[PDB]
């Protein structure tokens, strides 16, 4: 699964 802290700038639920 994706790691949402790989790039904090990415909001995966936008």
């Amino acid at each position, epitope marked *: *699964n*994706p*790691d949402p*802290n*790989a*790039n*904090p*700038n*990415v*909001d*995966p*639920n*936008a």
Partner: antibody, heavy 121, light 114 residues
Framework: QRQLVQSGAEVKKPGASVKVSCKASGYTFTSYAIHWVRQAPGQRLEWMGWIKAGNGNTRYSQKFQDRVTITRDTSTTTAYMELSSLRSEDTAVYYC??????????????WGQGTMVTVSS | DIVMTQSPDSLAVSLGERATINCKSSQSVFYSSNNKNYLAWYQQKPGQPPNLLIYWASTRQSGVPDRFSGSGSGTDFTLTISSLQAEDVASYYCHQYYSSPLTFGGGTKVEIKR
């Protein structure tokens, strides 16, 4: 116009340290993470780490964990990358970047112009 | 880490011809829960930083000419330049933001024949 302006090129001796600065302007500094990425001769772009400009938390690549320090100064909206125990593999162009800012309100991606560091006596 | 492998390493076409760049990720960058692919494409010219073209694998960034398009899902991705222009000579890089560390491909150098 959102932008990142880096400090000038440097030469440093093997074993020494280099600190590169990244001046941010034209956007809300504390909202985003600044990444550091380097581009060494003949090699792939290499992610080094990020700092959250607000609270100052960091994440470093395993490759650099023991040698890199990323900091920020909110009063001057400036981020810094310090790399110690320099070695021949470290000669490279170092970038700061707001990589893939993909939010509900915004979508942008900004890079500094790059800083060449030469490890040499 | 997620290794990003591009092919070909270089290509040359005439002005106005279609150019195709392939990128394969060593692990899937697809998340079934939100149907998204955690992939971006960059352009870089010598002496300059990279410029973002495409994100979420297929969303073209505002201001990028629409002759650029991205496609693919899972591990197999394609950057297409539908009609190569002189200003498109550059290297092109894929990028994943699925997992840490963030990684980039080795690049595809795109050239004009004239």
């Amino acid at each position: 116009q959102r932008q990142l302006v880096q400090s000038g090129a440097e030469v440093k001796k093997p074993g020494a340290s280099v600190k590169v600065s990244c001046k941010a302007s034209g956007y809300t500094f504390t909202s985003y993470a600044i990444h550091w990425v380097r581009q060494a001769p003949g090699q792939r772009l290499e992610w080094m780490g990020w700092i959250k400009a607000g609270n100052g938390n960091t994440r470093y690549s395993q490759k650099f964990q023991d040698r890199v320090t990323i900091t920020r100064d909110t009063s001057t909206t400036t981020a810094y990358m310090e790399l110690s125990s320099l070695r021949s593999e470290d000669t490279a162009v170092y970038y700061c970047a707001l990589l893939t800012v993909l939010t509900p309100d915004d979508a942008f991606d900004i890079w500094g112009q790059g800083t060449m560091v030469t490890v040499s006596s | 880490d997620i290794v990003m492998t591009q092919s070909p390493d270089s290509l040359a076409v005439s002005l106005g011809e279609r150019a195709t760049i392939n990128c394969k990720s060593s692990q899937s960058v697809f998340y079934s829960s939100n149907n998204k692919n955690y992939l971006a494409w960059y352009q870089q010219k010598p002496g300059q930083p990279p410029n973002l073209l495409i994100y979420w694998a297929s969303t073209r960034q505002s201001g990028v000419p629409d002759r650029f398009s991205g496609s693919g899902s899972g591990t197999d991705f394609t950057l297409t330049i539908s009609s190569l222009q002189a200003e498109d000579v550059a290297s092109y890089y894929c990028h994943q933001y699925y997992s840490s560390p963030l990684t980039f491909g080795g690049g595809t150098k795109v050239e004009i024949k004239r």
